[PDB]
Amino acid sequence: AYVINEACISCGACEPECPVDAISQGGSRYVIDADTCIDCGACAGVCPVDAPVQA
Ligand code: SF4
Ligand code: SF4
Structure with missing residues (x-):
C-alpha cells in the first residue's frame, strides 16, 4: 500500500489516475x-508535492 502523507494539498489530481x-x-x-492499492506508484x-509514499 501507498499512503498519502501530510504534504497533500487536496488538489484532487491523483483521484482519476488510480487504475483501481x-x-x-x-x-x-x-x-x-x-x-x-496495488503499489503502482501512479498517484x-x-x-x-509528492505526498503518496510506499509503506
Ligand atoms: S495529487 Fe497529491 S496533493 Fe493532489 S490530492 Fe493527490 S496526494 Fe493530495
Ligand atoms: S495509483 Fe497505484 S499506488 Fe496510488 S493508490 Fe492507486 S493503486 Fe495505489
Missing part, C-alpha cells in the same frame, strides 16, 4: 484504500 480507484477525498487530505507521479 483506490483514492478518495477525505477530511483534511485524500486517502488510499489499502485493501485495494505519486501526478502529485505536485
